[PDB]
């Protein structure tokens, strides 16, 4: 077993040219699709806000059309899922994870049209779901499609073009290339056995889809907080404390997000029409809330810059938090098409800020800016619910461009993952995979 | 299927004992990495202190610069040859093998040898980085506490070995993420699954970073300031530089490997023909650290200057080929010290050179040569050592130029791609392949 390694070391990093060229065409498509989906969703938010202006008089008539437009667009969404691809509900990041374990089918011919046009509806109605879910899943399925259409044989070509797909998926969802790459080699990989995921191949895909997003969304960042104040060493422990608070809350959110799935499964009971009707019900509520106090509704990317600057009051933040927890739950746990990834950043920012403020008045000698703590806490909910800290830390860093806050980010992030462990919490994306896989072994 | 459901619910469950020990590993590694870093500078200060007293007579100073650097190199090579032969060169090859369980982690020997030996070689002003020493000392420190505390198991062994070397790189460059990303790209047994707890690696990397920030706060290793952005129609220039780095990546490997062979003839394994050639190289570096210091030393001192476009086209080419020469001499001679850092410097000088060519070639892209310098900085790591993701995230952590992320990644990938299709190999796995195949031959 010594002589094998010498043969292996000299034959390391040898991905066949065919895989790499295909990785490139995977990314290119994923990006364009992630751009198409990103554009479509925006247009609908614009159309909906275009109708509110036609009915701007009569107050109850406006509140009705905000509901009915968001209801019908959610109704459209849930149906396209329930009738043509049941796997494309919820995030679908659990699904692509199982696909890499070879325990799930990657029915692209079904998911692509369902997740795209379905998500378009649910996101475009302004529900509390991210783009990730749709684009990550769509991503993997795109990469799978070209494995099938080009009939590429082997273990290496299947896992890799499935991985890069999902990678270039997240990369174009956040304009965050590294985050995509780092997501795959922390979360997505079969965590218990060795896999033939060519990391060099993942790159080329991620490179392409980023470029593809940069062609259409140039010069306009998703999040602009600008350069913040540094964090001196004697402050660090406060980030550890925030980590720990995020740590205990991390699993507590998981239990709710999982339990809420069960509690909503009774309302419809597996029935297609009791679901779709409940889907419009939650959808309309978001389109309603996207008018009465839009910080409770929507993707969430819109309050992050505002919360970080410390423009909300202590009262307002608490309201925004608890209300978003409510609306995050309802929309994701109801198995609507759309990720819980983004709304987790939003929730973490609002908590970070809140902690920052408490710290600002309690420790005037640290010369604290609450916005620092918001950034530390931004990717913390990812590190404690999803338990992909390194992904979360490099995701935040790619959108906030605040490297000077690297230590407090890592320390909060780690504090989240350690206390998320010793409270019996579980990786949310693996927990759904374990639930979906053990709900297949239990009706036989 | 039923196994996976039991696996997923039991994922990321590192026992508290490992995590506590991960924390104590880092804390030590950092402190030592700080201690080593201080010592090396102290001696560069002592050497520069003697040049002051013999500042008159011109050939007298050139001689004491030689003899100070010779003696300090001679002390280094000997400390390696007589008490730990495994502690020569980088030692990153070594720790890699230790993770595959095919090498012994003789800390009782390496720690004092690498530390006090490196102190000599580095502090004499040789073209070696801090990484080698700090990465190695790193893993060895982490191994020490596995032995002293008698921690049983596969997980405890690979983890406290990994974080050790991770917290090692972390304190070497004040680059936490670079440490963590090095371990899950290069260091990990690339061909089978390992029990390296990623969460444990963090805790160690955290501690050693803090340990370094306590002693070196408010002073960065590289300061380039915020550069201009890179417009989309420019990206292909970074692919072209990637390609150029791609073909040169292996060509440097061949020489660094081949120069080890050609220098092995000068001494032939003999201790005294080695040490006396060790002072010969060391002295030359301390002499060069006066006649044109940009060809000598760690190299971190020219990067800022090169990136600002302060050098002329001639100057750069000289500083490049001269560093090629001196980089080879110092690492290939198996002196203690890494080739990691000198490869950054080499890449900056090449990047800059490419930038300037591009500046007057395409005045309409409104180019800053310093952007290309940053793209090319970690490219030689991506092509010779073939750890692109670590290289990219290392540079980003020291230059803080995120807006240059796409050109960096493109150059970086362009290097790794063309470093493959010209038959080149991961230089740190190539030395492992050589040291392991000269044990069965």
């Amino acid at each position, epitope marked *: 077993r010594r002589r094998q390694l010498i043969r292996q070391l000299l034959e390391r990093d040898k991905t066949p040219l065919a895989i790499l060229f295909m990785a490139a065409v995977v990314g290119t498509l994923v990006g364009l699709a992630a751009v198409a989906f990103d554009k479509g969703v925006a247009w609908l938010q614009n159309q909906r806000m275009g109708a509110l202006v036609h009915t701007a008089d009569n107050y109850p008539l406006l509140l009705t059309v905000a509901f009915l437009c968001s209801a019908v667009l959610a109704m459209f969404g849930y149906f396209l899922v329930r009738k043509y691809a049941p796997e494309a509900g919820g995030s679908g990041i659990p699904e692509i994870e199982g696909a890499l374990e070879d325990q799930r089918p990657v029915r692209w011919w079904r998911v692509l049209p369902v997740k795209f046009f379905g998500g378009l509806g649910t996101l475009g109605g302004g529900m509390v779901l991210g783009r990730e879910g749709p684009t990550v899943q769509i991503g993997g399925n795109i990469g799978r499609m070209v494995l099938d259409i080009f009939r590429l044989k082997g273990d290496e070509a299947r896992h890799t073009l499935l991985a890069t797909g999902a990678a270039a998926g997240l990369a174009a969802a956040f304009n965050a290339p590294l985050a995509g790459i780092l997501f795959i080699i922390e979360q997505m990989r079969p965590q218990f056995r060795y896999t033939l995921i060519s990391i060099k191949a993942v790159f080329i895909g991620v490179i392409m889809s980023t470029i593809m997003y940069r062609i259409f969304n140039h010069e306009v960042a998703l999040i602009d907080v600008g350069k913040l104040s540094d964090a001196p060493l004697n402050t660090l422990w406060l980030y550890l404390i925030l980590g720990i608070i995020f740590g205990i809350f991390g699993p507590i959110f998981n239990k709710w997000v999982l339990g809420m799935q069960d509690l909503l499964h009774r309302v419809h009971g597996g029935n297609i029409t009791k679901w779709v009707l409940m889907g419009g019900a939650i959808g309309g509520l978001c389109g309603l809330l996207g008018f009465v106090a839009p910080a409770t509704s929507g993707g969430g990317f819109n309050l992050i810059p505002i919360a970080t600057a410390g423009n909300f009051s202590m009262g307002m933040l608490v309201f925004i938090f608890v209300a978003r927890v409510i609306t995050t739950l309802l929309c994701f746990s109801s198995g609507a098409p759309g990720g819980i990834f983004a709304p987790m950043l939003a929730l973490g920012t609002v908590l970070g800020t809140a902690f920052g403020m408490v710290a600002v008045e309690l420790f005037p000698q640290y010369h604290l800016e609450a916005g620092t703590f918001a950034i530390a806490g931004m990717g913390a909910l990812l590190a404690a619910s999803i338990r992909a800290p390194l992904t979360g830390i490099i995701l935040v860093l790619e959108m906030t461009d605040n490297y000077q806050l690297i230590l407090p980010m890592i320390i909060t992030g780690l504090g989240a993952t350690l206390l998320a462990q010793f409270t019996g919490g579980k990786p949310l994306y693996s927990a759904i995979l374990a639930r979906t896989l053990a709900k297949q072994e239990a009706e036989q | 299927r039923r196994q996976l459901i039991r696996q997923l619910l039991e994922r990321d469950k590192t026992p508290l004992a490992i995590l506590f020990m991960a924390a104590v590993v880092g804390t030590l590694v950092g402190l030592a990495a700080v201690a080593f870093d201080k010592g090396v500078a102290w001696l560069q200060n002592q050497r520069m202190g003697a040049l002051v007293h013999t500042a008159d007579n011109y050939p007298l100073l050139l001689t004491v610069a030689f003899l100070c650097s010779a003696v300090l190199a001679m002390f280094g090579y000997f400390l390696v040859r007589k008490y730990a032969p495994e502690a020569g060169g980088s030692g990153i090859p070594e720790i890699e093998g230790a993770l595959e369980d095919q090498r012994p982690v003789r800390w009782w020997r390496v720690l004092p040898v690498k530390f006090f030996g490196g102190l000599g070689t580095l502090g004499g002003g040789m073209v070696l980085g801090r990484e080698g020493p700090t990465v190695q000392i790193g893993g060895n420190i982490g191994r020490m506490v596995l032995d002293i505390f008698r921690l049983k198991g596969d997980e405890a062994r690979h983890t406290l070995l990994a974080t050790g070397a991770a917290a090692g790189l972390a304190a070497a460059f004040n680059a936490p993420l670079a440490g963590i990303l090095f371990i899950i790209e290069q260091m990990r047994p690339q061909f089978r699954y390992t029990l390296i707890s990623i969460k444990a690696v963090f805790i160690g990397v955290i501690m050693s970073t803090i340990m370094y920030r306590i002693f070196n706060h408010e002073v960065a290793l590289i300061d380039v300031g915020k550069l201009s952005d890179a417009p989309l*129609n420019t990206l292909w220039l970074y692919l072209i530089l990637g390609i150029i780095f791609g073909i040169f990546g292996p060509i440097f490997n061949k020489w660094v490997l081949g120069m080890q062979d050609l220098l092995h003839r000068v001494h032939g394994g003999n201790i005294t023909k080695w040490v006396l050639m060790g002072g010969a190289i060391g002295g030359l570096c301390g002499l060069l650290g006066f006649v044109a210091p940009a060809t000598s030393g760690g190299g971190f001192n020219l990067i800022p200057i090169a990136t600002a476009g302060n050098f002329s086209m001639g100057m750069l080419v000289f500083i490049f080929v001269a560093r090629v020469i001196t980089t080879l001499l110092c690492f290939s001679s198996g002196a203690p010290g890494g080739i990691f850092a000198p490869m950054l410097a080499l890449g900056t000088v090449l990047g800059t050179a490419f930038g300037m060519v591009a500046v007057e070639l395409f*005045p*309409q892209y*409104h180019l800053e040569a310093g952007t290309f310098a940053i793209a090319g900085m970690g490219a030689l790591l991506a092509a010779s050592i073939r750890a692109p993701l670590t290289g990219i995230i290392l540079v980003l952590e020291m230059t803080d130029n995120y807006q240059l992320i796409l050109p960096m990644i493109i150059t970086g990938l362009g290097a790794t791609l063309l470093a493959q299709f010209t038959g080149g190999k991961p230089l740190y796995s190539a030395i492992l392949a050589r040291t392991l195949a000269k044990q069965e031959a």
Partner: antibody
């Protein structure tokens, strides 16, 4: 964001004048500044650009010091020193903040302009 | 340098008219920009990169073309459009401007 240039006016043929362009509302760094002139009732002609750090300065087919472009990052002010003034240099002089789209550069924000008449 | 010249020297049309002016290039160019200059104003970056609109330009305006012939098009013109419109490029150095299409209004 506002570019407010001045310093132009009356000068005798063959002489020299310095043109000032002050700026406020945007980081004066990051941006290459440019100079573009327009002769009465005619078209637009490029004079010269300058990078943020004053370290790459190109002009149009002029001659020696026909035009001299400088800046003062601390003052937020752009300068144009025109030498050996002949009747063609009688024009309006805009300072323009230079930016790009896909990567072919445009002129983003134009000033109001000062007038340079060359008469005795 | 690249010598551009603009289609009509002075064109006149009544609001409602679809109106197109053209930027013709001595050599080949790419991603040209359009500038607007209303009477006694300093020019305003109007259209850029061949067809992108600057933020705050009535969406009746459009851009198109490649190589030798680039254009600007006011689909259903309005009288508040009376201006001398300049075209300019920077695909090749030094950047050069057009002549202008002094648009006039018929009422």
């Amino acid at each position: 964001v506002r570019l407010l240039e001045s310093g132009g006016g009356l000068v005798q043929p063959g002489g020299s004048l310095k043109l000032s362009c002050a700026a406020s509302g945007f980081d004066y760094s990051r941006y290459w500044m440019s100079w573009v002139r327009q002769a009465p009732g005619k078209g637009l002609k490029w004079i010269g650009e300058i990078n943020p750090v004053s370290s790459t300065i190109n002009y149009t087919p002029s001659l020696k010091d026909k035009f001299i472009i400088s800046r003062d990052n601390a003052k937020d002010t752009l300068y144009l020193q025109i030498s050996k003034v002949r009747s063609e240099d009688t024009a309006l002089y805009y300072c323009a903040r230079l930016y790009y789209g896909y990567g072919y550069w445009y002129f983003d924000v134009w000033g109001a302009g000062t007038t340079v008449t060359v008469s005795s | 340098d690249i010598v551009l010249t603009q289609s009509p020297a002075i064109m006149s049309a009544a609001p409602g008219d679809k109106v197109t002016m053209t930027c013709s290039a001595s050599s080949s160019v790419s991603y040209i920009h359009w500038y607007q200059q209303k009477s006694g104003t300093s020019p305003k970056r109007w259209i850029y990169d061949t067809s992108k609109l600057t933020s705050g330009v009535p969406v009746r305006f459009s851009g198109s073309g490649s190589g030798t012939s680039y254009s600007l098009t006011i689909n259903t013109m309005e009288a508040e459009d009376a201006a001398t419109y300049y075209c300019q490029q920077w695909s090749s150095h030094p950047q050069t401007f057009g002549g202008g299409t002094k648009l006039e209004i018929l009422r």
